[PDB]
């Protein structure tokens, strides 16, 4: 069984290699998730074929119980594994299985260096600094559902003050932080990637929530627990650290 | 089936309640893990009986493949669940199963406030500040096995300079940080608990490794995945955050 692996283009997890050399199949790609997949394939001993998710989506539900993205590929048995920065969530565990996480993270704050601001509490109780997230993304969906005191007030500043708060994508959000007095809320992994590359920018405070990226499989897959074991081995032998360093470290 | 739950006395996860009131069975205990177990028991719908691990150990192997502690209780089918700050590790996954983690953590540094020291790199390349860990603990075992450049040099300062480096327990280590110019390396969860209560002390740098506490079960237990689902629900509805706050927050 050559395993079909669904994944998604996302810097620095999965990228097309910057090359016009004759590269075919898996060799067309590079990134943290390609390195991970190679290690997994060497520990477990499997052949694999990387296929980019056709709709370019992670995986969400509609009002009819219909899934899209990598999650749908798994449900439909069109992929054996999803090796991607795919968050392990309650709703997704209803329909697919996940390895234990290979990376753990949380929502955090992207902002400028040299400011008294040290937490989400500092942004919540002031008006001068504008703050928000990407529209219809994971971080927005968190703030919308939240019932925690401080994050409810923050969502009001994002929803009722809708205009100068939310952004279209990652690129525009970072643009807003640099050019204007703006703070972006997004997944801490993305924030670390940015701060390594933009020395005027820093993470503010700790993690607002807690979650992990795991390898997705169809429910009952005999690979899930084996992948957990491989992940634990890679963590303990310092290989996940080095793989993270390879892709995240800047100039 | 009234589930037998193995656990271990460890502040603030599991403690005897400070009361002479007539309290029996599970009611004798309090702590983060008791609160967690109650939530799990309400989501899954099980009855349970908390039993402290007789040997008071987490679970390690000897040179014959023989286990002790909570891990042994699970292997022997004398407990259905281990609900404790029990780290999910490669070696333990050989012999028991684990839910996905309810708490994630890493090795970090406990030291005084107001010092140029900002990482493990700062401690590694200097002699003036003494640093170590608890003898034969998780953090020591990490440094001993490590092949990462900076942590190998740090282990030399702990092993070859054995006398004024390692400590007997948590209590003595914190005592060393306060009284002498000493930095303690230990699990970040423990560090946060201490810094909330000792305003002269702070965490230094980020996390040196990455790992999680999970609920242990015997291999094949039908409760493992259900517990993962309950944990994800608790995380997403902010309950793990509030439970952490309940037990960790200081004066
Ligand atoms: C690597 C990565 C993956 N994902 C997808 C998410 N983990 C999922 O599984 O849906 C994200 O939402 N983020 C953060 C993010 C957003 C956010 O944090 O709100 S909005 C967008 Br577009 C992104 Br790409 C990531 O950085
Ligand atoms: C809550 C908790 C549990 N454990 C046990 C460990 N998680 C395991 O599963 O063995 C720890 O080692 N630590 C840190 C620790 C040590 C360390 O970090 O080296 S040494 C000792 Br005695 C402890 Br109690 C914890 O803080
Ligand atoms: Cl699992």
Swiss-Prot record, chains A, B:
Name where it mostly resides.
Answer: membrane
Any idea which UniProt keywords this protein has?
A: Cell membrane, Disulfide bond, Glycoprotein, Ion channel, Ion transport, Ligand-gated ion channel, Membrane, Phosphoprotein, Postsynaptic cell membrane, Receptor, Signal, Synapse, Transmembrane, Transmembrane helix, Transport
Residues given in the record as L-glutamate binding sites: 85, 87, 92, 138-139, 187
Where is the protein localized?
Answer: Cell membrane; Postsynaptic cell membrane
Phosphothreonine: residues bearing it: 195
Q: Which residues are glycosylated?
A: 200
Q: Would you tell me the protein name for this molecule?
A: Glutamate receptor ionotropic, kainate 1
Gene source species = Rattus norvegicus (Rat)
> Which residues of the complete protein does this chain represent?
447 to 817 of 949
